[PDB]
Design a protein around this ligand. Sequence first.
Ligand SMILES: *[C@@H]1O[C@H](CO)[C@@H](O[C@@H]2O[C@H](CO)[C@@H](O[C@@H]3O[C@H](CO)[C@@H](O)[C@H](O[C@H]4O[C@H](CO)[C@@H](O)[C@H](O)[C@@H]4O)[C@@H]3O)[C@H](O)[C@H]2NC(C)=O)[C@H](O)[C@H]1NC(C)=O
Ligand SMILES: *[C@@H]1O[C@H](CO)[C@@H](O[C@@H]2O[C@H](CO)[C@@H](O[C@@H]3O[C@H](CO)[C@@H](O)[C@H](O[C@H]4O[C@H](CO)[C@@H](O)[C@H](O)[C@@H]4O)[C@@H]3O)[C@H](O)[C@H]2NC(C)=O)[C@H](O)[C@H]1NC(C)=O
Ligand SMILES: O=C(N[C@@H](CCCCNC(=O)c1ccc(I)cc1)C(=O)O)N[C@H](C(=O)O)c1ccc(O)cc1
Ligand SMILES: O=C(N[C@@H](CCCCNC(=O)c1ccc(I)cc1)C(=O)O)N[C@H](C(=O)O)c1ccc(O)cc1
Ligand SMILES: *[C@@H]1O[C@H](CO)[C@@H](O[C@@H]2O[C@H](CO)[C@@H](O)[C@H](O)[C@H]2NC(C)=O)[C@H](O)[C@H]1NC(C)=O
Ligand SMILES: *[C@@H]1O[C@H](CO)[C@@H](O[C@@H]2O[C@H](CO)[C@@H](O)[C@H](O)[C@H]2NC(C)=O)[C@H](O)[C@H]1NC(C)=O
Ligand SMILES: *[C@@H]1O[C@H](CO)[C@@H](O[C@@H]2O[C@H](CO)[C@@H](O)[C@H](O)[C@H]2NC(C)=O)[C@H](O)[C@H]1NC(C)=O
Ligand SMILES: *[C@@H]1O[C@H](CO)[C@@H](O[C@@H]2O[C@H](CO)[C@@H](O)[C@H](O)[C@H]2NC(C)=O)[C@H](O)[C@H]1NC(C)=O
Ligand SMILES: *[C@@H]1O[C@H](CO)[C@@H](O[C@@H]2O[C@H](CO)[C@@H](O)[C@H](O)[C@H]2NC(C)=O)[C@H](O)[C@H]1NC(C)=O
Ligand SMILES: *[C@@H]1O[C@H](CO)[C@@H](O[C@@H]2O[C@H](CO)[C@@H](O)[C@H](O)[C@H]2NC(C)=O)[C@H](O)[C@H]1NC(C)=O
Ligand SMILES: *[C@@H]1O[C@H](CO)[C@@H](O)[C@H](O)[C@H]1NC(C)=O
Ligand SMILES: *[C@@H]1O[C@H](CO)[C@@H](O)[C@H](O)[C@H]1NC(C)=O
Ligand SMILES: *[C@@H]1O[C@H](CO)[C@@H](O)[C@H](O)[C@H]1NC(C)=O
Ligand SMILES: *[C@@H]1O[C@H](CO)[C@@H](O)[C@H](O)[C@H]1NC(C)=O
Ligand SMILES: *[C@@H]1O[C@H](CO)[C@@H](O)[C@H](O)[C@H]1NC(C)=O
Ligand SMILES: *[C@@H]1O[C@H](CO)[C@@H](O)[C@H](O)[C@H]1NC(C)=O
Ligand SMILES: [Ca+2]
Ligand SMILES: [Ca+2]
Ligand SMILES: [Cl-]
Ligand SMILES: [Cl-]
Ligand SMILES: [Zn+2]
Ligand SMILES: [Zn+2]
Ligand SMILES: [Zn+2]
Ligand SMILES: [Zn+2]
Lengths: 694, 694
Amino acid sequence: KHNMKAFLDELKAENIKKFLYNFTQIPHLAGTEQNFQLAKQIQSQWKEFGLDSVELAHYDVLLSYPNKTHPNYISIINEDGNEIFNTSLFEPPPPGYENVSDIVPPFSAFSPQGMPEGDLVYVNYARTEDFFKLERDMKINCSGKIVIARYGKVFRGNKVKNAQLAGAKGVILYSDPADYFAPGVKSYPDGWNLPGGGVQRGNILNLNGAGDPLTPGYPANEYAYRRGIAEAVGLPSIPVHPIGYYDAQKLLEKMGGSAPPDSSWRGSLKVPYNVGPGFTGNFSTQKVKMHIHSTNEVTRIYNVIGTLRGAVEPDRYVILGGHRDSWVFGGIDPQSGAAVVHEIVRSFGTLKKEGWRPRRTILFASWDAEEFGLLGSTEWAEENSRLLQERGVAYINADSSIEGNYTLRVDCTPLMYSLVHNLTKELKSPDEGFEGKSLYESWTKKSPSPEFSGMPRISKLGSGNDFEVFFQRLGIASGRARYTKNWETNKFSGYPLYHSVYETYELVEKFYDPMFKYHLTVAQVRGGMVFELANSIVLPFDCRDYAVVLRKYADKIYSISMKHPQEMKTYSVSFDSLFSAVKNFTEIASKFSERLQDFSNPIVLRMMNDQLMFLERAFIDPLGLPDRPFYRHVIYAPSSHNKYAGESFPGIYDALFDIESKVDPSKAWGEVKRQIYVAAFTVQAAAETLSEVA
Amino acid sequence: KHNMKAFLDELKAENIKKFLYNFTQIPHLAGTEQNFQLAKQIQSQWKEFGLDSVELAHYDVLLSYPNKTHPNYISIINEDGNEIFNTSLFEPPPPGYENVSDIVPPFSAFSPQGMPEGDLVYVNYARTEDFFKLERDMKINCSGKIVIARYGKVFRGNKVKNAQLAGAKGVILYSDPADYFAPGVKSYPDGWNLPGGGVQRGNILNLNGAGDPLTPGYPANEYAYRRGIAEAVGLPSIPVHPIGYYDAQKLLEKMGGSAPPDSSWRGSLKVPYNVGPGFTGNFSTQKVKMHIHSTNEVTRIYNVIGTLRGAVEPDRYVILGGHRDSWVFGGIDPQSGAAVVHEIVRSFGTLKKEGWRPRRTILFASWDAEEFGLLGSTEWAEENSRLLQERGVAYINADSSIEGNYTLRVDCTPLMYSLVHNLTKELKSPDEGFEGKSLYESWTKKSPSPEFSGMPRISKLGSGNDFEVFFQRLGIASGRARYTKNWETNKFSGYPLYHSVYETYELVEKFYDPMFKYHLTVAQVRGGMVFELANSIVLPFDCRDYAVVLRKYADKIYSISMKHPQEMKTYSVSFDSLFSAVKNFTEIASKFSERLQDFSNPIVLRMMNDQLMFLERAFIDPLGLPDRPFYRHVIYAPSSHNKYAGESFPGIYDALFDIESKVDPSKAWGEVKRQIYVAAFTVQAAAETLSEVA
Ligand SMILES: *[C@@H]1O[C@H](CO)[C@@H](O[C@@H]2O[C@H](CO)[C@@H](O[C@@H]3O[C@H](CO)[C@@H](O)[C@H](O[C@H]4O[C@H](CO)[C@@H](O)[C@H](O)[C@@H]4O)[C@@H]3O)[C@H](O)[C@H]2NC(C)=O)[C@H](O)[C@H]1NC(C)=O
Ligand SMILES: *[C@@H]1O[C@H](CO)[C@@H](O[C@@H]2O[C@H](CO)[C@@H](O[C@@H]3O[C@H](CO)[C@@H](O)[C@H](O[C@H]4O[C@H](CO)[C@@H](O)[C@H](O)[C@@H]4O)[C@@H]3O)[C@H](O)[C@H]2NC(C)=O)[C@H](O)[C@H]1NC(C)=O
Ligand SMILES: O=C(N[C@@H](CCCCNC(=O)c1ccc(I)cc1)C(=O)O)N[C@H](C(=O)O)c1ccc(O)cc1
Ligand SMILES: O=C(N[C@@H](CCCCNC(=O)c1ccc(I)cc1)C(=O)O)N[C@H](C(=O)O)c1ccc(O)cc1
Ligand SMILES: *[C@@H]1O[C@H](CO)[C@@H](O[C@@H]2O[C@H](CO)[C@@H](O)[C@H](O)[C@H]2NC(C)=O)[C@H](O)[C@H]1NC(C)=O
Ligand SMILES: *[C@@H]1O[C@H](CO)[C@@H](O[C@@H]2O[C@H](CO)[C@@H](O)[C@H](O)[C@H]2NC(C)=O)[C@H](O)[C@H]1NC(C)=O
Ligand SMILES: *[C@@H]1O[C@H](CO)[C@@H](O[C@@H]2O[C@H](CO)[C@@H](O)[C@H](O)[C@H]2NC(C)=O)[C@H](O)[C@H]1NC(C)=O
Ligand SMILES: *[C@@H]1O[C@H](CO)[C@@H](O[C@@H]2O[C@H](CO)[C@@H](O)[C@H](O)[C@H]2NC(C)=O)[C@H](O)[C@H]1NC(C)=O
Ligand SMILES: *[C@@H]1O[C@H](CO)[C@@H](O[C@@H]2O[C@H](CO)[C@@H](O)[C@H](O)[C@H]2NC(C)=O)[C@H](O)[C@H]1NC(C)=O
Ligand SMILES: *[C@@H]1O[C@H](CO)[C@@H](O[C@@H]2O[C@H](CO)[C@@H](O)[C@H](O)[C@H]2NC(C)=O)[C@H](O)[C@H]1NC(C)=O
Ligand SMILES: *[C@@H]1O[C@H](CO)[C@@H](O)[C@H](O)[C@H]1NC(C)=O
Ligand SMILES: *[C@@H]1O[C@H](CO)[C@@H](O)[C@H](O)[C@H]1NC(C)=O
Ligand SMILES: *[C@@H]1O[C@H](CO)[C@@H](O)[C@H](O)[C@H]1NC(C)=O
Ligand SMILES: *[C@@H]1O[C@H](CO)[C@@H](O)[C@H](O)[C@H]1NC(C)=O
Ligand SMILES: *[C@@H]1O[C@H](CO)[C@@H](O)[C@H](O)[C@H]1NC(C)=O
Ligand SMILES: *[C@@H]1O[C@H](CO)[C@@H](O)[C@H](O)[C@H]1NC(C)=O
Ligand SMILES: [Ca+2]
Ligand SMILES: [Ca+2]
Ligand SMILES: [Cl-]
Ligand SMILES: [Cl-]
Ligand SMILES: [Zn+2]
Ligand SMILES: [Zn+2]
Ligand SMILES: [Zn+2]
Ligand SMILES: [Zn+2]
């Protein structure tokens, strides 16, 4: 029989291991020849595996690269202008790769060029609240200073945005062992910790969903009209560069001015973590100088797009996508995900060769230039937006399959919650101590829901990966799942060797997943979800789960507002319409669920499947969120303070945020009321898509 | 049998006549009690007629009304400030209605209040080219002047916008007998011409598709947040008031300054048509003073929405809509259309009582507040946008059924051309001399296509009626048809008694359509289109017709650009991508047509019907046109100089318009290239929706 069990049994750990090895021998940086050759390899193999069509879709987008003959570095310079200390020009390469060429040195992609020299101020994680503490409580002025911030807690692009608005003239990012060195584990190559010479690469854009900075709204195809650089979307205006903790220690050890305001500002290095500005008395005349010579350049990128045509509903698309480009070898990010995708394609292709086809069309994607701003997935979605919005059922992402070996991590739309719970009850746990138990059981035990006993935690989607255009722009139900660690305060910081030259095949095979059993479990979750979405007669979405969360998010936003009871009285700020809409949604969803259970008629079925598919789409506002026109989902957007975190009712959240500091309270509360009206209207309109159609 | 012939035969001229009489005895001004009582009457009757559900949808929108105890008028005042001449406070009422109350006096809806006094300048029709002639060729400065303009040629709101940008401090609009008095016909009540005391009412907004000025984007429901008046959309900033030609003669006869520049500036009154500024020597010290005291006020409006549920595809909607509100009695505009709609509902209801239902759902609408800015249809579409965009097949408008008695007039999307040609070949001509001939034959004879021999003229949709939100915002295939005159230069000016107190039942019954045969023919066209759209197994749209017009519009926009060959060389302005996209669309459409003719499989049918329904939707750009975010269709928008006229490739058209006058030619041609890229991309993306789906 050709059922889900046949699909799942065909998946093999040893194939995933072979593919991961094959994908991680040389760097695959976006826009380079090596990554184009990998794209051609994948296209060839997906054809062999049995897909109906496999094409490359290419775009010409703005990328950023260091200058190979003019390296980036930071100095401490004395009053004579002698550079008395320099940061490293490259990470020491790992064993057996000291002769690989084309390893890009650490840099912050899209940094402008410059050689700013100044006094340092230390800004902790450079979060919005860190800058509030500095400026409002400690009265420290960052204007004209170089800021130094530790990586962690929030997306680095938010750090740079915050530093810019504070008037910084440059930013130095570094990895503190407090956040990137787990106690009791050895540094790479002897364990999975970050060495003092290791450095985290990564872009520092603030694109807000735009895609290629030069072509917002439209695909960067051959005849595209491009904005000039000065009008490009999301580029930083000050130079930025990342360093490891050996180098950071040299920059921080001389720091003077104010003590850190409290212990949450101190990392694990043997330095005082003084905030500055500038160095202590003896070194008061030394300055820090950046030298950044990176260049932005329009460069061709390639997505691989494979199609397995549906037998019954070929005009309904279930998409499984993950990126192929890596900063260096990509042992975890992204090739641990790409190897899982490759084995899923292989498995579906095996069934196809035996005569089976899915009910709906499945599209498989190997995206390019994810690391430079989700460019490949966003350009392709801009090109195909009309097909996706009328035909897109679901998007399942597949970046890193593992970032630890403790338990499952899932973020998805509430419409997928029931699907995830049901699938994981049918899968075997790979965990020690849970042999013969379900993955649901182990996951629920290790990661309990904060609301409901006997259920696991599933989080909101944020951004920082390729599902963003599909979910936040186009309103296609999306999900993602991987294996993770037990390290809650580090849930947005990355694993220790994230985006470093040390993230290699050997890292994974020695320290994370020697038997490839966690990879295999993630392949069964991602693959199983795709199978059910593409094959279930009725789409496996439960609208009642959206009704439950909408009440939770309404209670939450109401509670934030109620911190300001006098203003709510003065400006007549009522959440009544929003609660009314949520109540109506709950009632209508309950009635729709009853009909869905209660109907041989394929028109009524498809009518009902269209109601299910277009429910996520109903939360899209075509006017977008304030000053973020490509974030259109009214219930969820990436947090304005941390692109990685999802925020619920973001329009109302941002209208309320720091409202006690706004100079015109009448205008600020007016905008809160406006966002409540938009949210109540959208929830009611989404509910009405589930009413009887006539 | 229940087929189209049964539907058509049930329609009766004498029922249309009864309904028109019933709808035109008292004024039905939007927001008044009388119009609410008519809405309740219609709701009751549509229920009786047999619709499944008939509800009122209400909104609270900004309307405008004169002050009943402080009337609007214009004076000529002498140097002492004595008002030596006053315009009329009301139109003399027609015979037998001198005792009807609540006839709104002539006013320009949404005019601000003010009492500006100044010298007059005469600006012909106040078109963009009229103001170019004044300012650029004649060197006359309108700044601080009161402008007087004759109605005609373009929408009055464009006149007021043009006068504002020229620096006018007020506008006087009047009806010249050249445009509103056909030679050889008598004035009302003895013929259908405009008397010298007659005055054309009408709004002077520049909404660009926004709907209610206070709630752009969202329905004006009970909890809506409203913009303050100073941020409202589209309100004029200078006072405006309309007058008849007896009063205009008094204002124009004393005019001095420059002679009219040529004969196209002279109307038919016995005055010189001097342009001014100001009066001749003897009267040089007299001024003109406006007194405008109208008020804008948020007021409830009511749409009637009737549903006839589809038997097979109830989640596909064919909508027949027309407005109910009138300036005064609405004998032609809109009740000649509303009476046709009422008889169509009656006919469909007769079939329904015999057990028939259409394949698809038909929605029938009686819109309110059309005259104040398409408010009722736009608010309702904003409320229901998610249902309409995923389920809307087509919208057929039904305002005035007659504006003359000569031949058919049709404006529609190219997707409906084949449908209109085929239907009119099956209908009888009502025209004298064509008894026993088809309507197609008479229409083709009287209104030949300017391109093809043996075909009739069908025009582009513009705006100025309730189809605008459905077509230009949401991208639902739309059409309209009425009987018209033979008076080509007056095709945007209105019939002589347009928006006057004289547009009565007696006007229609005595002078336009005594046998109601032209009404009946229009009911067969509108009703027939609705029947075919709601009942045909395959939707009756031909994508190849869009391919033909896209080539025509591409040739046209290329020819405009080619007036500037040196700039096209300097800035490398190429239309190659646009022609490439049009060629691809032609090829793909031809292949799709072949498949559509070549497939018992209801999935493939509906897949194909969805391709047809979503083709118009593919021309929508979610980012809208430049500074007109609610005009989203890339192929068609209302002309920026004349809201009534459609413009093709409007983004490129407006980028090219008057380009030789822009100060930064590099920037201006850059924007032309940007609009060519958006248009080529959109055409190619629309084409791709017709490719095989997987
Ligand atoms: C959740 O669903 C419910 C339906 O179950 C829906 O209820 C609707 O609420 C609206 C807004 O409150 C009601 O609007 C009223 O409609 C009547 C006519 O039906 C009007 O006469 C009312 O206006 C008068 O009263 C107002 C309030 O004091 C005054 O401001 C006004 O000037 C008038 O005097 C009012 O517009 C509507 O009837 C119901 N519909 C029903 C019960 O079917 C509710 O709105 C949904 N929630 C959301 C957020 O959409
Ligand atoms: C109309 O449909 C046709 C398909 O029938 C479609 O043709 C496509 O045109 C594009 C754009 O011209 C082609 O793009 C080329 O793709 C190849 C690889 O396939 C690239 O190597 C090419 O790039 C090189 O050449 C360029 C031009 O000189 C250089 O600028 C560039 O730097 C490279 O050296 C180029 O990108 C594409 O192959 C075809 N696709 C086909 C034939 O299937 C056409 O674009 C459609 N029209 C519109 C407006 O969409
Ligand atoms: O590296 C990225 N993403 C990794 C690391 C993300 C670190 C924080 N982790 C999470 O947000 C997270 C949440 C839920 C799950 I299930 C898994 C990870 C990832 O998604 O695996 N994306 C890069 C980056 O962060 O530099 C990125 C970020 C922004 C952008 O526009 C384009 C690319
Ligand atoms: O009166 C209106 N429409 C009438 C008169 C339009 C006069 C010009 N005629 C046409 O544009 C036309 C084109 C094709 C056909 I078939 C029929 C008429 C109508 O459409 O019958 N609409 C009113 C107005 O013009 O004051 C209007 C205008 C703008 C607006 O936002 C809201 C209402
Ligand atoms: C990764 O695996 C691929 C596919 O097996 C290898 O590419 C093949 O290499 C052989 C021997 O050079 C050629 O004959 C084939 O044409 C290739 N097939 C393709 C590209 O589809 C590739 O060598 C492996 N890469 C590494 C680093 O081991
Ligand atoms: C840090 O690097 C800088 C730049 O290479 C070094 O300064 C240069 O030293 C060479 C030879 O000694 C001079 O000819 C250059 O003119 C210097 N350039 C600049 C920009 O100062 C510096 O010596 C290095 N410092 C340390 C401690 O290694
Ligand atoms: C997850 O599994 C549950 C339990 O099987 C499914 O809920 C059942 O669905 C069937 C079919 O409609 C009903 O007859 C039962 O009454 C349901 N049991 C319940 C609600 O406890 C549920 O549909 C599955 N979720 C999916 C497929 O998304
Ligand atoms: C227009 O026609 C309607 C419907 O026939 C008339 O309204 C009816 O009036 C009678 C007598 O007053 C009442 O008994 C009914 O209740 C009404 N029916 C409705 C409103 O559905 C109305 O009188 C006519 N109007 C004019 C001006 O002739
Ligand atoms: C035009 O109307 C104005 C306003 O009603 C007339 O002027 C008024 O005349 C009365 C009585 O004669 C005075 O008490 C008012 O003070 C005047 N008002 C203003 C604003 O001037 C004027 O007489 C009328 N002119 C003509 C020719 O009829
Ligand atoms: C209008 O009528 C023409 C002539 O009947 C229709 O075109 C024919 O359609 C049938 C069914 O597909 C074909 O088999 C013929 O070959 C067509 N004749 C032609 C193209 O000359 C056309 O489909 C009708 N248009 C509609 C319904 O929109
Ligand atoms: C990189 O630096 C070299 C060496 O100084 C210089 O000649 C070249 O212009 C730079 N490359 C760029 C800016 O792409
Ligand atoms: C910070 O310093 C800059 C540069 O001198 C100054 O212009 C600015 O006003 C200062 N801001 C505060 C809040 O002290
Ligand atoms: C794998 O799991 C073991 C057992 O708990 C743990 O000690 C080890 O560090 C894990 N590896 C990683 C990378 O977390
Ligand atoms: C209309 O004019 C009257 C009479 O002068 C005045 O009292 C009232 O304020 C006005 N009504 C308005 C502005 O609605
Ligand atoms: C028109 O007159 C105004 C008012 O005095 C003046 O400011 C403006 O510059 C003039 N414009 C032209 C084009 O002469
Ligand atoms: C009706 O048609 C006749 C015959 O051509 C014409 O003389 C008459 O004026 C028409 N009525 C109108 C309003 O056009
Ligand atoms: Ca783009
Ligand atoms: Ca509105
Ligand atoms: Cl992922
Ligand atoms: Cl019409
Ligand atoms: Zn990644
Ligand atoms: Zn990454
Ligand atoms: Zn009308
Ligand atoms: Zn009108």
